[PDB]
Rosetta silent file (secondary structure, phi, psi, omega in degrees, C-alpha in Angstrom):
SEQUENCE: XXXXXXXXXXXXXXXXXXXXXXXXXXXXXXXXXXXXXXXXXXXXXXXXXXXXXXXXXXXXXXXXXXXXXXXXXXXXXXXXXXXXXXXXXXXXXXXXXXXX
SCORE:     score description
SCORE:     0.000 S_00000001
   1 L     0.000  153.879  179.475  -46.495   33.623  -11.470 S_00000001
   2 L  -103.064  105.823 -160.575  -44.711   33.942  -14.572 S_00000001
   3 L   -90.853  168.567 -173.499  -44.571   30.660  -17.098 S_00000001
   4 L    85.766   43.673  165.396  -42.003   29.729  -19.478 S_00000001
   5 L   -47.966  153.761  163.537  -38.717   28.505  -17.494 S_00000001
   6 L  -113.142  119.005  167.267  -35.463   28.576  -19.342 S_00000001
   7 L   -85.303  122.043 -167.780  -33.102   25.463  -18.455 S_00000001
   8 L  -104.096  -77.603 -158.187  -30.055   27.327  -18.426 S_00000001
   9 L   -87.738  151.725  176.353  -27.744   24.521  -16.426 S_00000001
  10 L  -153.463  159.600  177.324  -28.654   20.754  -17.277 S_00000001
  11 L   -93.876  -79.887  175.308  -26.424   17.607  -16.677 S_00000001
  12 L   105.308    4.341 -157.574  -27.351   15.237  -20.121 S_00000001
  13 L  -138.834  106.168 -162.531  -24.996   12.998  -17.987 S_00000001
  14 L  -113.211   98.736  138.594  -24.877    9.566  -15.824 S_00000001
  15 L  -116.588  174.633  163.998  -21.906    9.216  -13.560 S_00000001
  16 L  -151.867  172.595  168.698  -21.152    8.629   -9.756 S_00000001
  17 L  -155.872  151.217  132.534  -18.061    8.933   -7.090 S_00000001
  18 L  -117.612  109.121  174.864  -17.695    8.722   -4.026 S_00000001
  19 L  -168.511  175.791 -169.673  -14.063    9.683   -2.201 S_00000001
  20 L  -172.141   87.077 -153.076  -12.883   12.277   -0.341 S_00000001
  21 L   -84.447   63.774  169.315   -8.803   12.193   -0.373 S_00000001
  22 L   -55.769   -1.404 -165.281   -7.891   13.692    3.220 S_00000001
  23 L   -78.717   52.857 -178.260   -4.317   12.428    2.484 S_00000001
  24 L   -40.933   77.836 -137.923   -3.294   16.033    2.461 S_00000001
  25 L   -85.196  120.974 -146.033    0.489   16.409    1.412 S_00000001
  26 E   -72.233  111.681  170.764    1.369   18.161    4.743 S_00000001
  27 E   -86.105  135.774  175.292    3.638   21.816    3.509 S_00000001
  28 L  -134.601 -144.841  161.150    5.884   23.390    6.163 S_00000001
  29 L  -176.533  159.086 -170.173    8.966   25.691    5.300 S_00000001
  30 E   175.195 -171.426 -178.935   12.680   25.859    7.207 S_00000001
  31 E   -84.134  127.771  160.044   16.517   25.789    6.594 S_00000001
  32 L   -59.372  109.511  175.918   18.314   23.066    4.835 S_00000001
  33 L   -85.505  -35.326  172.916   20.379   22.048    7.459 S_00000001
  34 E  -154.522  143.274  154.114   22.503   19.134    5.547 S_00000001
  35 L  -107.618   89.182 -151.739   21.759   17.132    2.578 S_00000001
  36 L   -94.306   99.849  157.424   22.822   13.770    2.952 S_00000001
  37 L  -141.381   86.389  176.508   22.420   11.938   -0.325 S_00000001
  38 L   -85.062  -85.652  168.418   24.193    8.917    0.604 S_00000001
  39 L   -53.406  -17.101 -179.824   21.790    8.354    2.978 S_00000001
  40 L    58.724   42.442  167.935   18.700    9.630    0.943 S_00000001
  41 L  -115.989  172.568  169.802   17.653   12.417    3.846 S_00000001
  42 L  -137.218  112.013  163.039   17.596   15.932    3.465 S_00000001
  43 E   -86.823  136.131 -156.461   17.798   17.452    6.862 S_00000001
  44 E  -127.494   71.552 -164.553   16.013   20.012    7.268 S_00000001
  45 L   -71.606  116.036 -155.368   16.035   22.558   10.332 S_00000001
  46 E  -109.730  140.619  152.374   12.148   23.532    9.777 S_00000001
  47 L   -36.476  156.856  138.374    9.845   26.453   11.578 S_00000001
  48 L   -21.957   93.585  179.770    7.094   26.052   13.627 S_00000001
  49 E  -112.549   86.589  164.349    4.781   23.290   11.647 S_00000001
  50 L   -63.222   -1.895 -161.389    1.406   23.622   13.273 S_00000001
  51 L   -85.476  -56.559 -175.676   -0.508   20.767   10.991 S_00000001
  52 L   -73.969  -44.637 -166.379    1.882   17.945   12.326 S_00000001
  53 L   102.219   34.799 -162.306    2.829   20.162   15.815 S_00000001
  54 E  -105.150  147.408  179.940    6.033   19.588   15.769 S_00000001
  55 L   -87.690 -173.542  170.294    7.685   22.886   16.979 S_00000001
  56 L   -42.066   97.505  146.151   11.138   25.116   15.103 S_00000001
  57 L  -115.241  102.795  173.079   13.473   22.045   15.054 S_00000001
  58 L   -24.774  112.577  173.951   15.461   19.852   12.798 S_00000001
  59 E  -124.984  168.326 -174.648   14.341   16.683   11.114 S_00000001
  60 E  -108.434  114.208  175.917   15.848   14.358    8.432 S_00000001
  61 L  -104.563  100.295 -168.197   13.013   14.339    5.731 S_00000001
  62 E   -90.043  144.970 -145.256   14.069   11.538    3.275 S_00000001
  63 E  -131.316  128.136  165.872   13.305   12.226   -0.869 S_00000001
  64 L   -52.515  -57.917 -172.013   11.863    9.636   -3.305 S_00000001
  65 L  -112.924   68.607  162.716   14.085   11.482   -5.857 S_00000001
  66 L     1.845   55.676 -168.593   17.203   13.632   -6.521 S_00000001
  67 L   -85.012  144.447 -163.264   15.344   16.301   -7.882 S_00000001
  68 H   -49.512  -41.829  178.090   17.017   19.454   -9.881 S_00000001
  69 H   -61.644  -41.326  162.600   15.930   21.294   -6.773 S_00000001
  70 H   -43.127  -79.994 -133.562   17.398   18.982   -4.364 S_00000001
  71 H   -78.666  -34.919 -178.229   20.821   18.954   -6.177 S_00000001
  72 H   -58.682  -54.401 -160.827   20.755   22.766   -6.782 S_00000001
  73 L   -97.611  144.356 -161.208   19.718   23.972   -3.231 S_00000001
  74 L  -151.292 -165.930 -138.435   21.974   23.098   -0.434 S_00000001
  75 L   -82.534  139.668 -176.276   23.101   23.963    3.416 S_00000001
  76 L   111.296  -43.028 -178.682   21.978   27.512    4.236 S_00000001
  77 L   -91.100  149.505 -175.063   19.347   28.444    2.003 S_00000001
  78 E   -81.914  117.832  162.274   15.458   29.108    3.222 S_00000001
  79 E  -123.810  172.876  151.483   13.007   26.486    1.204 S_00000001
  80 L  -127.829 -163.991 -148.908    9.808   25.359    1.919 S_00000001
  81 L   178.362  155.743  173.920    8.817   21.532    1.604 S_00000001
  82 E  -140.946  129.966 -167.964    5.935   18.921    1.611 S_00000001
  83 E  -152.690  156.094  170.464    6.284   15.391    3.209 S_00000001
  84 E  -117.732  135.883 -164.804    3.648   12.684    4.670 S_00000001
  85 E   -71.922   96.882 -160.928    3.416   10.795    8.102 S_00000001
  86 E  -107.285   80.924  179.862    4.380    6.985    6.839 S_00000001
  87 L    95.435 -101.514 -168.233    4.449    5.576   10.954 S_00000001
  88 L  -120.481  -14.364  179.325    7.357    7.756   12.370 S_00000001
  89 E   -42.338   72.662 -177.097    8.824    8.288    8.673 S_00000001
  90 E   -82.048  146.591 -179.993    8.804   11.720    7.224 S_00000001
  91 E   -94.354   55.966 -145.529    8.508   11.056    3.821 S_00000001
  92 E   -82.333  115.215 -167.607    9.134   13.970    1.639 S_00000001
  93 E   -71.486  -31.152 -163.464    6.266   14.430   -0.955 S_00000001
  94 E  -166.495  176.708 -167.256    7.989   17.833   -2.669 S_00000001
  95 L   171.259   80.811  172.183   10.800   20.817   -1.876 S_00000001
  96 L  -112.693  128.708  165.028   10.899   24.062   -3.525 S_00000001
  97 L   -13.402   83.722 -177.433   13.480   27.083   -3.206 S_00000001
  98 L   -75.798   11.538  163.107   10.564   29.745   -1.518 S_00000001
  99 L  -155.625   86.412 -165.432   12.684   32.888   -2.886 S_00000001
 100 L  -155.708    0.000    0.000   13.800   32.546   -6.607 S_00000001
């Protein structure tokens, strides 16, 4: 054997955590089919979303916020999107333009 380690990595440091966040802000991608926001949905006819299962269909995906993307992008254009399962609720976490 050879003597005379070198501590290269060291902490010098007392913390803890414990979590693991699985709350996974689910991304899918599809058509804007209508933007209603009166109602505060953005329907959405979306692809094939294996994470949830739901197959190429429409859903009304409802937005915390009137965001410059929201207001910009409208009936026609290809986005993608991120929303979360609140019951039966989707709940749309985010929604960007996917060719710009």
């Amino acid at each position: 054997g050879a003597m005379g380690m070198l501590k290269h990595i060291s902490h010098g440091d007392m913390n803890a955590a414990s979590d693991a966040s699985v709350q996974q802000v689910i991304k899918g991608t599809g058509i804007v089919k209508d933007i209603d926001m009166n109602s505060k949905k953005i329907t959405i006819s979306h692809e094939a979303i294996p994470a949830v299962g739901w197959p190429a269909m429409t859903m009304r995906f409802t937005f915390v916020n009137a965001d410059d993307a929201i207001n910009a992008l409208k009936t026609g254009n290809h986005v993608d999107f991120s929303f979360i399962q609140q019951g039966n609720i989707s709940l749309l976490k985010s929604i960007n333009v996917t060719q710009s």
